[PDB]
Amino acid sequence: PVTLANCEDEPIHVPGAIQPHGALVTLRADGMVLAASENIQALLGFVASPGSYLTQEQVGPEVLRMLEEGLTGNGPWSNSVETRIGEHLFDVIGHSYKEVFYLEFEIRTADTLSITSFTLNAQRIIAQVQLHNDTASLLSNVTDELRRMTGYDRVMAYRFRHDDSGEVVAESRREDLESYLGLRYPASDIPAQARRLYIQNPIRLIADVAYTPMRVFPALNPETNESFDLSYSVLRSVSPIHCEYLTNMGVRASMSISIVVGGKLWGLFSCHHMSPKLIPYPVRMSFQIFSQVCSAIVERLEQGRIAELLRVSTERRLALARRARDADDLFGALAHPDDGIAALIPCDGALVMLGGRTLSIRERQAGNVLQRLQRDPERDIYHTDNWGDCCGVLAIRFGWIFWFRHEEVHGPSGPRLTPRGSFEAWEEVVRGHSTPWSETDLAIAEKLRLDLMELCL
Amino acid sequence: PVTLANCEDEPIHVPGAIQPHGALVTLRADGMVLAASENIQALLGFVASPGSYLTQEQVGPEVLRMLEEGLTGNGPWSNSVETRIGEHLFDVIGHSYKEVFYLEFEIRTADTLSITSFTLNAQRIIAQVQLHNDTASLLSNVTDELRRMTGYDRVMAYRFRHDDSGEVVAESRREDLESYLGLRYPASDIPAQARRLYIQNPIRLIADVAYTPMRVFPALNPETNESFDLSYSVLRSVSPIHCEYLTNMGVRASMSISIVVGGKLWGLFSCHHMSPKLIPYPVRMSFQIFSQVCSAIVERLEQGRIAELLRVSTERRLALARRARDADDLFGALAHPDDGIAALIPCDGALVMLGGRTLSIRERQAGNVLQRLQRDPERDIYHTDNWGDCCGVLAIRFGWIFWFRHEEVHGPSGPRLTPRGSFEAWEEVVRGHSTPWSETDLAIAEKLRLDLMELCL
Ligand SMILES: C=CC1=C(C)/C(=C\c2[nH]c(/C=C3N=C(/C=C4\NC(=O)C(C)=C4C=C)C(C)=C\3CCC(=O)O)c(CCC(=O)O)c2C)NC1=O
Numbered sequence: 001p002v003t004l005a006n007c008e009d010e011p012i013h014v015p016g017a018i019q020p021h022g023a024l025v026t027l028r029a030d031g032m033v034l035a036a037s038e039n040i041q042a043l044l045g046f047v048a049s050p051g052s053y054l055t056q057e058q059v060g061p062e063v064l065r066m067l068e069e070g071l072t073g074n075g076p077w078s079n080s081v082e083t084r085i086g087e088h089l090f091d092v093i094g095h096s097y098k099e100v101f102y103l104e105f106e107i108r109t110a111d112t113l114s115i116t117s118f119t120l121n122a123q124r125i126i127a128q129v130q131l132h133n134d135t136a137s138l139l140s141n142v143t144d145e146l147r148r149m150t151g152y153d154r155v156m157a158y159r160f161r162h163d164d165s166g167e168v169v170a171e172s173r174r175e176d177l178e179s180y181l182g183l184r185y186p187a188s189d190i191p192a193q194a195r196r197l198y199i200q201n202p203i204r205l206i207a208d209v210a211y212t213p214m215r216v217f218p219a220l221n222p223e224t225n226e227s228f229d230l231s232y233s234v235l236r237s238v239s240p241i242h243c244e245y246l247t248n249m250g251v252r253a254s255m256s257i258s259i260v261v262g263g264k265l266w267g268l269f270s271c272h273h274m275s276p277k278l279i280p281y282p283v284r285m286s287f288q289i290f291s292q293v294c295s296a297i298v299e300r301l302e303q304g305r306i307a308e309l310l311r312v313s314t315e316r317r318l319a320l321a322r323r324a325r326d327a328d329d330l331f332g333a334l335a336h337p338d339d340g341i342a343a344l345i346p347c348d349g350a351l352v353m354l355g356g357r358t359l360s361i362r363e364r365q366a367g368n369v370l371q372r373l374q375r376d377p378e379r380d381i382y383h384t385d386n387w388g389d390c391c392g393v394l395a396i397r398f399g400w401i402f403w404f405r406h407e408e409v410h411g412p413s414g415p416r417l418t419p420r421g422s423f424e425a426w427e428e429v430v431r432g433h434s435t436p437w438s439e440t441d442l443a444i445a446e447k448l449r450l451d452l453m454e455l456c457l
Numbered sequence: 458p459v460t461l462a463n464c465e466d467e468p469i470h471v472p473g474a475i476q477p478h479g480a481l482v483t484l485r486a487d488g489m490v491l492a493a494s495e496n497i498q499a500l501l502g503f504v505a506s507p508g509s510y511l512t513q514e515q516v517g518p519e520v521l522r523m524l525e526e527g528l529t530g531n532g533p534w535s536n537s538v539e540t541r542i543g544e545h546l547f548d549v550i551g552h553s554y555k556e557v558f559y560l561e562f563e564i565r566t567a568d569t570l571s572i573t574s575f576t577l578n579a580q581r582i583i584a585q586v587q588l589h590n591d592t593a594s595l596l597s598n599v600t601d602e603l604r605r606m607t608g609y610d611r612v613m614a615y616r617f618r619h620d621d622s623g624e625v626v627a628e629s630r631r632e633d634l635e636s637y638l639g640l641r642y643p644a645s646d647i648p649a650q651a652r653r654l655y656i657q658n659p660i661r662l663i664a665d666v667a668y669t670p671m672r673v674f675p676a677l678n679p680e681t682n683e684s685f686d687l688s689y690s691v692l693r694s695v696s697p698i699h700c701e702y703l704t705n706m707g708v709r710a711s712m713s714i715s716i717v718v719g720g721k722l723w724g725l726f727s728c729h730h731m732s733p734k735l736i737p738y739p740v741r742m743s744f745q746i747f748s749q750v751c752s753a754i755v756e757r758l759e760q761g762r763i764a765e766l767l768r769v770s771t772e773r774r775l776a777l778a779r780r781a782r783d784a785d786d787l788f789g790a791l792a793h794p795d796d797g798i799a800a801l802i803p804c805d806g807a808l809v810m811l812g813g814r815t816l817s818i819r820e821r822q823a824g825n826v827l828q829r830l831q832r833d834p835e836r837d838i839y840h841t842d843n844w845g846d847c848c849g850v851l852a853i854r855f856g857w858i859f860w861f862r863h864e865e866v867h868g869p870s871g872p873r874l875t876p877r878g879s880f881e882a883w884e885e886v887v888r889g890h891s892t893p894w895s896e897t898d899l900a901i902a903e904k905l906r907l908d909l910m911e912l913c914l
């Protein structure tokens with residue numbers, strides 16, 4: 001069973017069920033049917049039964065021809081074919097994962113997207129990514145152009161803070177709906193297994209939210225005695241908790257393109273529709289390549305950005321060092337608000353201490369803290385939240401230095417699952433918390449301390 | 458006719474003939490046939506006659522249906538369909554340019570490429586474009602990878618320098634073949650239209666270089682009294698001159714991917730094969746969009762590069778300026794050999810004259826150069842090449858300043874159309890030319906002069 005307590009540990013990769021807008025058949029390396037969704041018969045007029053092998057006369061030669069090239073293939077398999085089965089024309093998408101072949105039958109409802117038309121989609125959307133040299137212009141723009149394309153009546157962009165928390169930094173919607181810019185959720189709104197997934201799968205599609213799931217039997221793969229891993233499965237089934245959530249938002253359909261930097265989910269575009277919605281495989285696949293592109297483009301942008309700040313910052317220290325080391329008045333050099341140490345780490349208030357002379361730039365909380373490290377008289381460095389009147393406190397020893405950050409920063413069934421609700425349970429974790437001390441800010445205070453360890457007079 | 462005097466100005470966009478591995482039907486806005494290749498009967502049943510409209514029984518319904526989307530659609534039309542005609546299976550690729558609709562029927566010879574397969578060709582190659590930061594490594598890799606994908610007996614990357622000239626900076630070949638790395642051809646090897654075209658069309662295909670071509674009648678479009686513009690045409694026929702050339706190179710098939718920055722062809726991938734060779738439209742199409750991606754990547758990658766050198770460059774100047782503006786005897790401040798002038802623009806030797814004092818870094822020539830700006834006694838700047846003992850010469854007045862660059866840089870029917878015969882024709886353009894003075898160098902020597910125009914004592 002799934003509650004607000006079993007939220008973060010839910011194995012959403014191995015649900016043993018799929019959404020109903022298609023059907024699943026799984027097979028072992030030799031083509032034998034190991035399991036299938038319970039709707040096959042309804043959808044397709046086969047009754048795939050374990051031990052069976054599919055035959056032209058239920059699945060068409062186009063499928064088997066396909067699957068064969070999968071069975072006699074060497075690497076990770078992925079492919080698909082647009083066959084017509086008895087009742088309907090189909091998008092049948094296969095792929096092998098672990099040691100299992102999945103055949104997912106998703107219902108095609110269109111004409112054929114020319115191998116060309118497909119391209120101008122991809123190219124039309126990539127085009128947006130390459131106009132801009134600013135990371136936020138980028139998101140703002142593509143966020144628009146995606147809507148013009150899909151028709152999804154809400155499409156947003158999310159950025160993910162280092163704490164894996166989440167913020168809505170771009171949006172385009174149908175006016176009727178409430179706006180979302182600036183909204184913040186917790187890391188806890190997207191579990192490590194969903195996040196892990198979104199990293200693996202560029203694109204996730206929820207066809208209908210209140211869908212009533214369709215199960216695969218056996219729920220467990222006899223060959224392996226483990227359940228079936230449906231990551232990389234298209235009709236894989238969505239966690240109920242997240243289904244409740246979307247409904248509490250008044251949403252019926254979904255889709256998300258991923259953005260990935262490092263090996264991490266840097267953020268994602270999320271598509272919402274007030275009614276059910278289904279983007280075809282082929283289109284999704286224009287977006288899959290979009291995502292690859294987008295992520296790259298965003299990665300090099302961001303490495304350049306921080307590379308820069310990182311430079312502007314270190315050039316500062318080094319400047320400050322020659323200035324102090326080459327003057328005799330260090331108190332006057334070290335505390336000039338422009339040659340100010342405050343210039344070095346991003347803070348609200350700072351402090352130079354050496355001898356019996358102090359200066360509170362931007363003094364009392366300092367009587368206490370030099371009293372805290374009294375039980376630690378061999379520390380040359382100090383750092384903390386959530387703590388007088390300022391919570392951020394970083395302290396380096398040479399004679400001391402201090403940097404501060406105060407933190408003025410900024411129906412249904414379950415307790416938390418809503419927009420303004422996840423932000424209500426976001427806040428209570430962040431009032432103890434000043435803007436956390438960047439991996440860069442410990443390196444700055446550190447280099448600086450050492451740097452002044454140098455001055456002999 | 459086409460000779461070496463006449464190759465500069467050739468209209469390769471309007472030949473009035475295509476290549477034989479396909480067929481072409483041009484049609485006006487109401488779909489009436491205005492022209493057709495001469496092999497239309499040879500390749501297909503019909504005799505497409507100006508005036509005629511296509512009928513299902515000539516061309517299939519898939520094409521007629523396609524063309525219909527085109528005739529009623531509004532903007533640039535681009536599209537294809539895979540239809541069986543009488544004799545063969547085809548890739549009918551169509552598009553509209555100016556006010557004409559082209560229907561190219563290129564011979565399909567494979568099984569259908571799935572949308573998925575189409576997608577990882579794309580992503581496989583894109584993936585190669587986003588591992589590296591160095592502009593050079595990037596090229597070096599995709600060069601390799603394209604060979605692993607097409608099989609082209611040769612794969613290469615060209616780079617073009619601001620003087621519209623060309624260098625080969627990446628290779629992957631069948632070893633039996635001479636290696637081209639480090640070769641250099643003039644701008645004259647790719648005429649303005651070639652180049653301008655290579656910018657519009659990302660991709661070009663040549664299947665048999667000794668192909669005896671296929672005309673289209675009427676050579677001239679009644680509606681417009683001007684020839685048909687095959688700019689965007691796939692089967693567009695290639696200049697004879699470039700053919701005579703490739704065969705002198707012993708090459709029967711060719712394929713080019715564009716890399717574009719600014720509105721400018723920054724470089725390209727030329728693929729060569731020593732027997733005839735055709736890469737299917739759908740596959741072409743994946744490279745077409747790779748051309749988009751690679752082009753953007755390199756644009757940012759390169760703009761960071763130049764931006765840096767552009768920053769270190771100006772940083773130096775401004776460094777030197779505060780060091781003299783704030784210092785006392787300038788002949789020596791301008792002249793710690795490291796705070797030196799030569800350390801501000803790329804040269805081989807430089808010179809600082811003022812008063813009656815000279816110092817030849819890296820004096821006599823000084824009395825002669827001031828004697829050649831005697832007939833221009835009010836020149837504060839001077840710049841030249843091809844010229845004493847140096848041909849690159851740039852001069853600034855405040856007392857003067859000079860920077861130097863010497864020049865030790867580095868069958869058929871017509872003479873020059875050969876690899877080493879183009880490189881031989883190249884040397885003449887460069888034997889009396891030093892590395893030209895960049896837009897940047899004229900800005901440095903300028904800002905500097907201005908900077909030293911501030912000094913009073
Ligand atoms: C304003 C909107 C808003 C949302 C949507 C939010 C949480 C949130 N949960 C998400 C996915 C998800 N969230 C969950 C599970 C959970 N979901 C939970 O809220 C909790 C507490 C759990 C687990 C403890 C799952 C399983 C997914 C992805 C499911 C899938 O697509 O497979 C997503 C990503 C997909 C999307 O954008 O639609 C968000 C933004 N916080 C917000 O402020």
Ligand SMILES: C=CC1=C(C)/C(=C\c2[nH]c(/C=C3N=C(/C=C4\NC(=O)C(C)=C4C=C)C(C)=C\3CCC(=O)O)c(CCC(=O)O)c2C)NC1=O
Nearest residue numbers: 464465642645646647651661695696698699727875876879
């Ligand atoms: C070692 C190899 C080498 C080459 C390939 C070269 C010139 C050269 N000519 C090119 C295209 C071309 N060159 C021409 C025409 C000319 N070509 C000429 O050399 C001249 C003198 C003219 C006309 C005055 C045309 C028309 C094309 C492109 C044709 C097309 O693809 O439509 C290309 C691009 C396509 C390719 O690389 O195959 C090159 C590199 N110089 C060299 O040293």
